[PDB]
Amino acid sequence: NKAPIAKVTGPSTGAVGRNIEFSGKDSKDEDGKIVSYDWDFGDGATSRGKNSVHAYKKAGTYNVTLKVTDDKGATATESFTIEIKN
Ligand SMILES: [Ca+2]
């Protein structure tokens, strides 16, 4: 098996209190299927889904982590920086 490769699409800037839409659908497993897309939004919040949403309560800079898992259980991550403005 080869582990998958995580790819996040979504905004790199958003605004406080607004729902930010993220996707992991461009992630790729060369030899199988991605079976889960886990998100850590950098403010303690987590979600799961090929698409996910999060609103940040405070302006600042956050690193979002996407963790993809393939059909064999191998994992990969991406760290993606988002700026949240007032
Ligand atoms: Ca694989």
Numbering used by the authors: 795 to 880
Sentences from the paper on this structure:
Clostridial collagenases are among the most efficient enzymes to degrade by far the most predominant protein in the biosphere. Clostridia employ collagenases for nutrition (e.g. saprophytic strains) and host colonization (1–3). They are large multidomain proteins of ∼115 kDa belonging to the gluzincin superfamily of metalloproteases. Here we present the crystal structures of the peptidase domains of ColH and ColT and the collagenase unit of ColG in the presence and absence of the peptidic inhibitor isoamylphosphonyl-Gly-Pro-Ala bound to the active site.
Although the previously reported ColG crystals contained the PKD-like domain in addition to the collagenase unit, the PKD-like domain remained largely disordered. This disorder is presumably related to the presence of citrate in the crystallization buffer, which titrates away Ca2+ ions. Because the crystal packing did not tolerate rebuffering to introduce calcium, we produced and crystallized an isolated PKD-like domain spanning residues Asn795–Asn880 to investigate its calcium-binding properties. To verify the proposed calcium binding site in the PKD-like domain, the crystal structure of an N-terminally extended construct of the PKD-like domain of ColG (Asn795–Asn880) was determined in the presence of 10 mm calcium at 0.99 Å resolution. In this orthorhombic crystal form, we identified six proteinaceous ligands, namely Asn795, Lys796, Asp825, Asp864, and both of the carboxylate oxygens of Asp823, which together with a seventh water ligand coordinate the calcium ion in a pentagonal-bipyramidal geometry. In addition, an N-terminally further extended PKD construct (Ile792–Asn880) was crystallized in the same conditions as the Asn795–Asn880, but the additional residues (Ile792, Ser793, and Asn794) could not be traced in the electron density, indicating their flexibility even in the presence of calcium (data not shown). Notably, in both PKD variants (Ile792–Asn880 and Asn795–Asn880), the calcium could not be extracted by incubating the respective crystals for up to 4 h with 100 mm EDTA.
